Design a protein around this ligand. Sequence first.
Ligand SMILES: O=C(O)[C@@H](O)[C@H](O)[C@H](O)COP(=O)(O)O
Ligand SMILES: O=C(O)[C@@H](O)[C@H](O)[C@H](O)COP(=O)(O)O
Ligand SMILES: [Mn+2]
Ligand SMILES: [Mn+2]
Lengths: 189, 189
Amino acid sequence: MMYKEPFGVKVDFETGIIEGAKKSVRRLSDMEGYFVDERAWKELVEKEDPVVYEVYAVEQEEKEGDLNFATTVLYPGKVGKEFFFTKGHFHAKLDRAEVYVALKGKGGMLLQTPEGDAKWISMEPGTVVYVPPYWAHRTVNIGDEPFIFLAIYPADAGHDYGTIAEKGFSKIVIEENGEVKVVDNPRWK
Amino acid sequence: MMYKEPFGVKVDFETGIIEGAKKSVRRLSDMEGYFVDERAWKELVEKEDPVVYEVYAVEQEEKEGDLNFATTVLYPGKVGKEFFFTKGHFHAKLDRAEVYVALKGKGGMLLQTPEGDAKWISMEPGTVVYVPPYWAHRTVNIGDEPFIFLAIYPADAGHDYGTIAEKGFSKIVIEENGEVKVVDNPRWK
Ligand SMILES: O=C(O)[C@@H](O)[C@H](O)[C@H](O)COP(=O)(O)O
Ligand SMILES: O=C(O)[C@@H](O)[C@H](O)[C@H](O)COP(=O)(O)O
Ligand SMILES: [Mn+2]
Ligand SMILES: [Mn+2]
């Protein structure tokens, strides 16, 4: 058989860039139907259409037992009162877990089961987050600077974006009165 | 079903300590038959029996698709000319990969296939190492300070220490004339 070649890659903990990896870019215009305030969404697309996040992924052939890894640079910002976040997804193989390692900035993870129960975990540099089997996961930047992390996940986990794209998460993360709040999502069913 | 509880845990990138995790300690006396210079090994056990490394592990029930993670603090030192290293192991489920994230110090990984072909990857802070399916892996501290890293691995990978405990790695990492060398292991067959 072919034994795949082990390698090291340099990851800059300040920028989240993985050398030689190749940027994927999600702009706000790529996230129609995600934010609670749709008029604020449309207005911010019209005015700027900012980058919400960039991902650098190092991925293997989809195979049981193997591992992918990726950094994300989640930029600071809000759509109305709602903080910039990642689209969020379940795994296609639902029981695949994930481990995140927060590197820079201030953020957190929203997680949700298929039954709709949600949980928020704060993330600051050094926080390692265990994303268990069956939990959808979205990251949120609650600060003024990029929120950068590294995620390691099974190479056969896949992605289910569609479920979240239609129903959302049952909780949202907003700023009111200069204070960060995690509250029920008024649009969730 | 029970959806396991997501959590965050704080990892100190300076000490490698995972809060609430619980030290496993490997002393030199726990590594009989590992180092090329057995008399140097015995003498250093007699004189000090130093800690070679400590591990902090956060482990799940063994289950396909799930993930464990662990930090290691590999202390600086030599047995004769050979740098302190971890015992090293294959996975029990051979095709399970691993991802390492170097946090502090200066070190590297030695990897080996079941056919005996070895590869060395240098590790400095920020280096992420892809340990592919089928490769045994050992880390080595080539510096004067603790070499600290975080590793993420499948919860069902298991460990095969025995193979390495008998045959070793086909390469060793030594200091001669103040220079670090990776050379053939004279005791390998
Ligand atoms: O492994 C992961 O889940 C991450 O690398 C995410 O894919 C990344 O943060 C981007 O988020 P999303 O995939 O939800 O758009
Ligand atoms: O996941 C791993 O392989 C690491 O956490 C190692 O177990 C750790 O570095 C200790 O090395 P060893 O298991 O070879 O004694
Ligand atoms: Mn994921
Ligand atoms: Mn391992």
